[PDB]
Every structure is written in structure tokens, then in C-alpha cells.
Design a protein around this ligand. Sequence first.
Ligand SMILES: *[C@@H]1O[C@H](CO)[C@@H](O[C@@H]2O[C@H](CO)[C@@H](O)[C@H](O)[C@H]2NC(C)=O)[C@H](O)[C@H]1NC(C)=O
Ligand SMILES: *[C@@H]1O[C@H](CO)[C@@H](O)[C@H](O)[C@H]1NC(C)=O
Ligand SMILES: *[C@@H]1O[C@H](CO)[C@@H](O)[C@H](O)[C@H]1NC(C)=O
Ligand SMILES: *[C@@H]1O[C@H](CO)[C@@H](O)[C@H](O)[C@H]1NC(C)=O
Ligand SMILES: *[C@@H]1O[C@H](CO)[C@@H](O)[C@H](O)[C@H]1NC(C)=O
Ligand SMILES: *[C@@H]1O[C@H](CO)[C@@H](O)[C@H](O)[C@H]1NC(C)=O
Ligand SMILES: *[C@@H]1O[C@H](CO)[C@@H](O)[C@H](O)[C@H]1NC(C)=O
Ligand SMILES: *[C@@H]1O[C@H](CO)[C@@H](O)[C@H](O)[C@H]1NC(C)=O
Lengths: 163, 216, 333, 49
Amino acid sequence: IKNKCVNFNFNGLTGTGVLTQSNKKFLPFQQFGRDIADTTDAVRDPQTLEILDITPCSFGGVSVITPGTNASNQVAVLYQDVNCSNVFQTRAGCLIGAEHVNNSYECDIPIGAGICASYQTSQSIIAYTMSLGAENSVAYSNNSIAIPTNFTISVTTEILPVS
Amino acid sequence: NQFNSAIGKIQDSLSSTPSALGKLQDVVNQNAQALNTLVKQLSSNFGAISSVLNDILSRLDPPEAEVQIDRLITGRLQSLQTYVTQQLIRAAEIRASANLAATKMSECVLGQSKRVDFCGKGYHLMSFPQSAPHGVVFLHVTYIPSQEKNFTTAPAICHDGKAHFPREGVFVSNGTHWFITQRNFYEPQIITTDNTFVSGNCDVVIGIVNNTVYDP
Amino acid sequence: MTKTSVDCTMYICGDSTECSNLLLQYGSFCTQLNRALTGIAVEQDKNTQEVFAQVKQIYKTPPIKDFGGFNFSQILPDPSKPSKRSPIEDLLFNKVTLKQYGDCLGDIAARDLICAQKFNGLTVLPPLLTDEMIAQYTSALLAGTITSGWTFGAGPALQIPFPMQMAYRFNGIGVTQNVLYENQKLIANQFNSAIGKIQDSLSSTPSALGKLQDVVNQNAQALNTLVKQLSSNFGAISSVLNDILSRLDPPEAEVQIDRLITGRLQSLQTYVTQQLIRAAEIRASANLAATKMSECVLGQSKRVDFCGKGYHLMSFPQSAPHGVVFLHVTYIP
Amino acid sequence: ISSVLNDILSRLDPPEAEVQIDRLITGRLQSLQTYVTQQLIRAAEIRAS
Ligand SMILES: *[C@@H]1O[C@H](CO)[C@@H](O[C@@H]2O[C@H](CO)[C@@H](O)[C@H](O)[C@H]2NC(C)=O)[C@H](O)[C@H]1NC(C)=O
Ligand SMILES: *[C@@H]1O[C@H](CO)[C@@H](O)[C@H](O)[C@H]1NC(C)=O
Ligand SMILES: *[C@@H]1O[C@H](CO)[C@@H](O)[C@H](O)[C@H]1NC(C)=O
Ligand SMILES: *[C@@H]1O[C@H](CO)[C@@H](O)[C@H](O)[C@H]1NC(C)=O
Ligand SMILES: *[C@@H]1O[C@H](CO)[C@@H](O)[C@H](O)[C@H]1NC(C)=O
Ligand SMILES: *[C@@H]1O[C@H](CO)[C@@H](O)[C@H](O)[C@H]1NC(C)=O
Ligand SMILES: *[C@@H]1O[C@H](CO)[C@@H](O)[C@H](O)[C@H]1NC(C)=O
Ligand SMILES: *[C@@H]1O[C@H](CO)[C@@H](O)[C@H](O)[C@H]1NC(C)=O
């Protein structure tokens, strides 16, 4: 069986993985070929002499976006290293269970390359692009100065651990 | 009145929002969680048949039991070593934070700092210390300008050849007259032989305008 | 630095059901390891916050660009290209050098290292702030520095022409403004020539950005060493789980599997400790960089030899992969 | 059974001496790693100073 993750037993060597065809050339006195971290990757076939490669069938990265237990039980899932109802494609991987919008707000739950997620109103989970802040543009010139007329006194708190 | 209102509002804001003293609470939680993990890692049997000394001592003679005891001893020594290493790293981080706090106490509290964004956002005025469990809180009192206005300016002033430069402040004009003011607070003043000094001829400054100085 | 994550079950057992059952007795250890690494990663995205998020509003550069005789058409972004970068930023980005299941499945003949370390439960996470947002932050900083000066760091930004700002800065360092006002063109020419020659010097030297390359090389070498340490049998009869499970009954295989488990666990612990130490060093460096941005960019500093050799005038920030570059302008008698 | 390699190599054949040798190797490697870690931390403090 090829191109399926299977349990295999080749001449007593047992394992679990996917078989495929490669172009490795084996000398007549060789039967096995192992990787750098001593993992058997190339195996001949006793019947129908040929060289095949073994690759594990578990691969990827999964993250779970949740609003918290005492808010709701709805969950979004982020699959890295994939190219995909509600499916959104980001550079950090596919996102399932969230609705894409065009507005821009602050960040609640960081997701990846400039994408943030939040739980907002019926309620839902929304993914969007984080905003760097407002936009401003002062008018430069060579004759105009700006001088303040009033002021204010501000009090701010800073907290530092000691021991 | 502004200062009193500011301190009252600071007190109210601290009272209203619990999620303010995050760092000290995080430190305490980290310590407690570390000890709790150390306590509950006793249930693991690092390859031994059981995690209880009494069972091994009750079911086996000494020459068959020292092996299990040795495995447990090695595991628990490794656990203690890991705990000590993590504590050392956290101690180093806290030492750095305490050094920063000592520097801030030396500079912002015992004087006035010229550094930007060191003792608060804005032009620093003063600071006050307050104690807290395992930490300190600095109340920074600073100055912030506002309510700006546009004016017309020129670098120097031509006064029959002796170009005049402002001794301190900026030259401004509202449309008909000319004045010299200070940079931050708007307060115009007429021009005399003071506030100015002369250097060179009025044929090299790029932007010098024609006006008169009412020198007494 | 790089944000990494590790999966204990894949690294130690590797999709074996005989394993991952004896591993339960050590489970309370691995929940520690990740809870350490996560603490590193969340800190990294925080570091970039104290360096580039000093300002709150994105400023836009004026379209006239006279500025007396001064010429900034190497720091300000060039609109006639993507990524909205600067030529110096382009050179810096190019100088520093740095995959779905089908990609790693088809790329067998050439043994990629990234696929090899991804098949063993080692993953790299992307940073939160992308490069374009960093460039936007830097552009806002330059615009505020050029048009408003040092004022926008404390309160609302106030407009002021550039020669007046330079006269104020000379007055700050201890020389009368009339010196600048009567020597404008020569000073502007000196500034422009200095900028040009600094760009040329950056282009000429290949081994100039040593520190950032050192950081990326350190991370890559650490991950590769962690991958290669799987070929060592810590006193067992073999380094392959399948051979042990194929030649021995469970009661005899228990000992060998336990030995392998202990060895791989201590390897992971060593890696985590090294990462923690390096993270502390990077934290110190980032704090220094944030202070330098606060004091040399948003104002003029009086500390000796802090914002460059000689009497300080101003500084300009530039982004770079995992780092920042400061251009300091100084006065020398 | 002993802290001296000579005694183990004198009283036991290789197959049985291998176990004790492995135990000693692991212990001494652990000691060296602990020393290196403490040196790294002290070096960081010295660098700050
Ligand atoms: C600022 O300097 C740049 C670089 O010298 C100037 O760009 C040059 O412009 C001339 C004429 O437009 C071209 O012949 C050069 O090839 C340009 N150089 C580069 C590197 O592109 C720019 O004009 C200057 N701007 C000001 C306002 O002085
Ligand atoms: C082995 O025998 C089976 C009989 O079912 C046959 O199908 C297969 O082709 C044989 N293999 C070789 C290499 O002759
Ligand atoms: C959001 O923007 C995209 C692209 O401009 C557009 O196709 C879509 O209709 C907009 N609205 C929603 C709800 O996605
Ligand atoms: C300045 O502000 C104070 C309070 O904010 C106000 O009472 C006063 O009238 C203001 N004065 C000017 C000139 O704006
Ligand atoms: C100063 O002039 C600019 C441009 O004309 C204008 O946008 C700004 O509002 C003016 N300032 C005030 C306080 O009116
Ligand atoms: C400018 O200030 C002078 C000073 O008294 C005043 O007489 C004049 O009316 C002012 N002009 C305007 C347009 O405000
Ligand atoms: C300000 O810039 C304009 C635009 O060219 C110019 O005409 C004017 O002369 C400049 N101001 C001075 C004082 O030179
Ligand atoms: C200033 O006065 C001189 C001579 O009095 C004259 O040559 C010059 O044109 C005047 N400048 C302006 C702007 O009126």
C-alpha cells in the first residue's frame, strides 16, 4: 500500500508511516538507509526489488482561540503550515471559526503577522488587522511657528518590583 | 487645584481598577506556583515500580531495594537542581529591576532629571515614592503644554546693517508688529537693545527681515 | 530573537504507542518546559513594543521637501517601489541573510534541515508586528523629528523650520547660533556628503552587521544541535525505538526506553536553560536600545559618549532584521 | 559499587563493568554541566558590572 499512512513490517522492522517512491541507488549489499538522527528512512522491498522512502504522517501546528469558559464555548482553530463556511487565509496559516472584517481596532488576542482576534456582538469571533493608531500630518513651512498658550500638570504612576 | 485634582483622580483610578498591580501579583504567583509544582512532583516514579518508599521497603529486601531507592534519589535531586536554577535566573532579573529602581530613586526623587521619558512623560517636575508588597510605586508630576497657536517668524532682523539675533527666545509677528518670546509659554515682548546681539552685516542671513529696535 | 516551540511527545516518543504511556510518569515535567518557552516568546513581541511604539500617531511627511539645503532623500521612504522602504533600509535588509506537508514530502532528494526539524516537533512562530508596520513606525519617527523636532516627544507636535532647529541645537552644544546662520551652505554640503559616504561605506563592507548574523546563527546552530543529539544512545543497546520494540518483549524494553527518555529529557532541559540565558541578554540589549531611542532621537543628550563620539546634535533610526541602527550626527572641533 | 575505575576494571569483566561505568559517566557529565551553568550566570553578572 502506497501514499497512505500505514503500519508496516519489513523483514521484522516494524513502524508507522507513509511510503513513497524515490530515486536512491542502493549497492547490492545494502538493505536499509538511515537519516542523520539514526532513523530508518529508505528500505528495499523483498518482493519487487525497489527503493522506497518512509515519512511520518504527523505534521503541523495547531492553536486554539477561545473567549474563555464563562463567556461562551465557541472556539476558533489556527492551522499553521496549510494553504486553505468561515475560512480565512493569513500568512501565519489558515483560521477556521472566525469572521473576517474590514474595520480596524486594537489587539485583544495576537494571532500572527498583523492579525488580531476578538469576541464581540448575538456574539461572534472576529479576526481583523491591528491598527497602529490614528493618522496625523503637520504642515511644514519656512515661516510658520507654533507656540502653546496653555499647559497642564499630569501625575502618572510607575510600578517596580524590588525583591 | 490642578495638582490636587490630579492626585485625587489617581487615587480613584487605582481604587476602581483591580488589574493595575499586575507585576507584584505575578511575582507572588510565580513563587507560589513554583513551590506547589515542587511539592506535587513527588508522585512521579522515575522508572521505579512505585513512588512510595514504604511500599518498596515493605515488599522487598534491602539488596533488591537499593536500586529503586537510587532511581528515586536521582530523580528528586534533578528536580531540586532545576528549581534552584530557575530561582537563580529569577533572582538575576529582580536584581536588575532593583538596580533600576535605586537609580530612579536617586535621580527623580532627590533632584530634577533632564533625561527624556525617564521620570514620566513630559517635562519632569518631581516625583514621590510609595511602598508596596515587594515593590515600589513612583508618582511622577510632569508638565505638558497645549492650546497652540500659529505665528509668523524670521531668523534675524535688519537694523541698518547690524543683524540682530535673539539672546533667548524666538522672533514672532502677528501681522503688523514684531516681538521676541520664550519657546514654550506664549508671552510676547517688545524689542530693545537687550534680548538681542549683533554679529555681521545684513547681506548674508537667508531670511532676515527689515524692522527697528526700540533701544533706549 | 527567534520564537520557538517544542512538542515533547513527538520529539521523545515519535508516534509510538508503547512510548507516550511510560512518558506519563514524567508528564509534569514537559508542562514546565513549554510554560518556560512561552514566557520567552511573549516577551519578544513585547521588546519590539518599547523600541518602535514610542509615538502614538502616524505622521506623514510633507510633499515639498525643501529643508533649506539639507537633503534627506536617502532616509525618507521612496514611494516608487513596494515595501515603502529607504535605500539605506534596503541595503540593510539585503545584507542580513536568513512549508506545507506536500513541500516536505516532495523535497526528499535534497535533505532540507527545516523539514527535518519540523518532523521532530520543533516549530518557529512568526512575530506579531510585521516589517511594513515597523517601517511605518520609523517613517512616523523621522517625520516628527524633521518637522516638529524634539517637541512631539512631550505633548502635541509643534511645527518649526529646520534651520531654526539646527540653530537651537548648536546653542545647546555650546556655540552661538550666528555661527550656523552665516555658514548654512557649507554645513549643509558637509551633512549631505557625510550621508552619501556613510551609505557607500555600508555598501562596501560585507561583514559589518555582525551581531544580527551572530544571533540568527546561534539560534540555527542550537536547533541543529538539538536535532542531531537524537543519534546518541544513553547506555541503551540502540538509538532507534523501532529496533528495541522489534527485538524485545515489553518487560525488557522498559529499561532501554527509560534510559532514552531520561537522556532526551535532560537534552531538552539544557536547551531551555540556554534559551533562557540568551533571552535575558537580549532583554538587556533591548532595554538599552529603548533608552537610546528615548534620549538620542526624541531629544538631545548631554551624556558623554552616549549618542556618538563628540558633541551630540541628533540621531536617526533605521529598522533591520531583529535589530535597530542609529545614525548619530556629531560636531568636532 | 565503587568510585574508582581501577577497582571495577580489576574485579569485573567488560559486560558487567559497563553498567557501573555508564553510571559514573552520567554522574560526572551532570557535575560538569552544573559547573558550566553556574559559570554562565556569574559571567552575566560580571558583564553587567
Ligand atoms: C538629494 O540627493 C540625491 C542624490 O544625489 C539627488 O538625486 C539625484 O538627482 C539628480 C537630478 O535629479 C540625478 O541626476 C541623480 O542621479 C540623482 N541621484 C540619485 C542617487 O538618485 C536629489 O535630487 C537631491 N535632492 C535635493 C532636494 O537636493
Ligand atoms: C511472490 O509470490 C506472490 C504470490 O502471491 C507473487 O504475487 C509475487 O509476485 C512474488 N514475488 C516475487 C518477487 O516473485
Ligand atoms: C471587506 O472587504 C472586501 C475586499 O475589499 C470585500 O470583498 C468585502 O465585501 C468587504 N466586507 C466584508 C464583510 O467582508
Ligand atoms: C487654561 O486652562 C485652564 C484650565 O484648563 C483654564 O481655566 C484657563 O482659562 C485656560 N487659559 C487659557 C488662556 O487657555
Ligand atoms: C496653523 O495653520 C495650519 C495650516 O494653515 C492649520 O491646519 C492649523 O489649524 C493652524 N493652527 C491653528 C491653531 O489654527
Ligand atoms: C498685533 O499686536 C499689536 C501689539 O499691540 C497690536 O497693536 C495689533 O493690533 C496686533 N495685530 C493683530 C492683527 O492682532
Ligand atoms: C520660503 O519658501 C518659499 C518657497 O520657495 C520661498 O519663496 C521663500 O523665499 C522662503 N522664505 C524665505 C524667508 O526665504
Ligand atoms: C531693507 O532695507 C534695505 C535698505 O534700507 C533695502 O535695500 C531692502 O530691500 C529692504 N528689505 C525689504 C524686505 O524691504
